[PDB]
């Protein structure tokens, strides 16, 4: 899961995925580009696509992208889609095997980032698919703590409810 697949053609695929160039990613993948091309930061085309490029997420998954690739800070594509609020990408990643409880090097899970960023439906979908509400980050904070510390009342209510059971 820790890629560092690096090359000229890999730089092109990473750039096309981060620029939202759907047709250019299709051309590079139809001609042998490495779907998990990476670099010294462990970032892959699917991490770049998680930043709101659903059609590119679908193409890279069709070519076998590692859905749980972890970069040098321990973030996976699911952490980034949850942080940026892209509900449909979070749904597709989970339907393709994404680890709902992946923990970054500073202990941040996808649920911590959705509670911190104020993305309620994403928090609800991760919760329903198994996210650990008692996970502590580097600062001993749980997702409820971060929702509370960031003023996201609705998410804190949902998390408060889930601990009640």
């Amino acid at each position: 899961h820790h890629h560092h697949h690096g090359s000229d053609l890999g730089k092109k695929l990473l750039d096309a995925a981060s620029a939202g160039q759907d047709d250019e990613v299709r051309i590079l993948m139809a001609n042998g580009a490495d779907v998990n091309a990476s670099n010294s930061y462990g970032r892959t085309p699917l991490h770049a696509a998680a930043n709101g490029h659903l059609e590119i997420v679908d193409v890279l998954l069709a070519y076998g992208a590692d859905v749980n690739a972890s970069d040098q800070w321990g973030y996976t594509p699911l952490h980034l889609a949850a942080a940026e609020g892209h509900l449909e990408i979070v749904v597709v990643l989970l339907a393709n095997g994404a680890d709902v409880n992946a923990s970054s090097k500073r202990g941040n899970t996808p649920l911590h980032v959705a509670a911190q960023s104020g993305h309620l439906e994403i928090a609800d979908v991760l919760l329903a698919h198994g996210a650990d509400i008692n996970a502590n980050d580097y600062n001993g904070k749980t997702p409820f703590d971060l929702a509370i510390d960031n003023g996201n009342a609705d998410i804190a209510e949902v998390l408060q409810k889930a601990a009640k059971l």
Partner: protein, 255 residues
């Protein structure tokens, strides 16, 4: 055909930020400083100095999020340049300079040298994304945003990196830091000994030859009493320490 030496400070004398050295403070934000420094230089170069601004490291460091990495705990230059093309960046100068919308909030410190400022400490806490300008400043945060037209990686090629700096201005790069690099004062750096301390991002603004050794001219963000007034030279042409392997840049929106 490229000259044997090139210094963006000499090629674009009317762009003051190319000469300036910043201080990231007790925060692992080199990824952010290399980006806003080179972006500041390119905004001036590509508007023929009609627009000269210090781009805010604070804005980039606090608002990008996990797409750019971990704030004061390390970050990712390619997504920093992407954020500038996406959301833009406001202006913002040095700590307590009151220059721009969001000047840097982390105080300067001594990096691997003795001096009158406090010693740098462990990576601090990342400051909050506060989308509001300093009270004394006008325009508003939204109107102060400067946007990039595009961003891109440069190939791991000495020649392509020189051509890109020559034509479009300073770029951001990263390299592996070994402990002998922390003691740099002058000369062309070449790793000889020391433990690996990690990858660090910087701004490359030129190249030359010194003592028979080809080199890249680089700006660090450890203030001016570190290195050679804040700058350093490192072996060029051999992807030394990975210096030619993670170069990124981009063109500003001339709007």
């Amino acid at each position: 055909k490229l000259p044997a030496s090139f210094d963006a400070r000499e090629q674009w004398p009317q762009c003051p930020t190319i000469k300036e050295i910043r201080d990231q403070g007790s925060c692992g934000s080199c990824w952010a400083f290399g980006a806003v420094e080179a972006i500041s230089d390119r905004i001036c170069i590509h508007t023929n100095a009609h627009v000269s601004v210090e781009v805010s490291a604070e804005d980039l460091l606090t608002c990008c999020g996990s797409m750019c990495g971990d704030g004061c705990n390390g970050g990712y230059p390619a997504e920093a340049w992407n954020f500038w093309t996406r959301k833009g960046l406001v202006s913002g100068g040095l700590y307590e300079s009151h220059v721009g919308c969001r000047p840097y909030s982390i105080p300067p410190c001594e990096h691997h040298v003795n001096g009158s400022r406090p010693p740098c400490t462990g990576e601090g806490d990342t400051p909050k994304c506060s989308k509001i300008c300093e009270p004394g400043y006008s325009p508003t945060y939204k109107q102060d945003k400067h946007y990039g037209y595009n961003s891109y990686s440069v190939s791991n090629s000495e020649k392509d990196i020189m051509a890109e700096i020559y034509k479009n201005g300073p770029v951001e790069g990263a390299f592996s830091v070994y402990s002998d690099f922390l003691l740099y004062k002058s000369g062309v750096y070449q790793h000889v000994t020391g433990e690996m301390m990690g990858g660090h991002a910087i701004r490359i603004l030129g190249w030359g030859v010194e003592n028979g050794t080809p080199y890249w001219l680089v700006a660090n963000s450890w203030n001016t009493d570190w290195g050679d007034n804040g700058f350093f030279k490192i072996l060029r042409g051999q992807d030394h320490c990975g210096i030619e392997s993670e170069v990124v840049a981009g063109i500003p929106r001339t709007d």
